[PDB]
């Protein structure tokens, strides 16, 4: 939250955009991994 720091941070480019996008993609990857995995465990027919 310090403005002086934020001012200096800006000189490193869109650093935080890169951090957020990299993690966003990495997190989507698990939702996709899970969705695919369960779609395959799922039975068509099953007994109670």
């Amino acid at each position: 939250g310090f403005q002086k720091c934020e001012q200096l941070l800006r000189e490193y480019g869109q650093f935080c955009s890169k951090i957020n996008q990299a993690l966003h993609g990495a997190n989507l990857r698990q939702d996709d991994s899970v969705r695919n995995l369960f779609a395959s465990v799922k039975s068509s027919q099953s007994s109670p």
């Binding site: 939702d31 969705r35 465990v41 799922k42 027919q45 007994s47």
Partner: protein, 97 residues
């Protein structure tokens, strides 16, 4: 709120650290009951899925009947399986118990 009204559980509490350090742990895609539903339906499909040709039909047969076909399929003859059905069930039960 738990981390404010109770505070950290112990030294190096990485869950309460989230609101301090600036990071967040996100919830998983499926809740527990849904994941349980998937493996529960899977359990009930085993005897009738690994039975014959194709993946399209389901044989609602007893688990035990499935085991005997599985044992026959690996080289144990039917005369043996028939004489030993209780012995086989007991050994299976010991393995899981």
């Amino acid at each position: 709120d738990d981390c404010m009204q109770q505070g950290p559980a112990s030294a190096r509490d990485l869950i309460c650290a989230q609101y301090v350090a600036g990071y967040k742990v996100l919830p998983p895609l499926m809740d527990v009951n849904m994941e349980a539903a998937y493996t529960s339906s899977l359990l009930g499909s085993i005897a009738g899925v690994g039975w014959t040709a194709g993946l399209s039909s389901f044989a609602a047969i007893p688990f035990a009947q499935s085991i005997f076909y599985r044992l026959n399929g690996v080289g144990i003859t039917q005369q043996v399986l028939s004489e030993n059905q209780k012995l086989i069930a007991n050994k299976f039960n010991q393995a899981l118990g």
